[PDB]
Design a protein around this ligand. Sequence first.
Ligand SMILES: Cc1cc(N)c2ccc(Cl)c(Cl)c2n1
Lengths: 156, 39
Amino acid sequence: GETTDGVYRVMTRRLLGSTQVGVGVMQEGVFHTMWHVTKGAALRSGEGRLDPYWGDVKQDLVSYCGPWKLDAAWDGLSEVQLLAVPPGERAKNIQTLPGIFKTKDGDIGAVALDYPAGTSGSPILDKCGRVIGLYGNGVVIKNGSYVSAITQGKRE
Amino acid sequence: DMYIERAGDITWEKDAEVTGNSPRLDVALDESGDFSLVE
Ligand SMILES: Cc1cc(N)c2ccc(Cl)c(Cl)c2n1
């Protein structure tokens, strides 16, 4: 059905009413979201059907209709914008300077912003508007606040 | 069954709300995709 580029909400009817479970990015005919949002399940786009194509629980990512397309990366210096799409609220750009998740396998950018769990899959953008990663997989720090990683996939 | 609904264009917006800090956190990623703090 709808295959236009942009940001989309991932919804469900299994729970009470229409509950938003996550967010995703349509780009080049491919839907990109986080694995924990859909659990690899097929999606509906109006009358059409989005079937998974690639997924990985470790990376917490999943693409529908084709391979992962988003290949931009945080430069490690510039401020970024979280295009937050919160449950029952309008899309809203929030500018921040990312922190760092230091891991044994390398450093990853991290965004210190606290939004409902149903916001997971919201894209993070560079100054060109290119998607550098997805929000929604991270850790809870000492003060109770949430810090998500900038999660990006690998384009072939 | 899950479904998708459009929420907007992907553009950088000038004069957006600038908020949030930049912490440096030592973390561990497990086989299930869960991050944990290594403090
Ligand atoms: C405790 C907490 C607080 C949040 N804002 C949050 C946002 C996204 C996701 Cl995926 C999770 Cl698990 C979250 N958990």
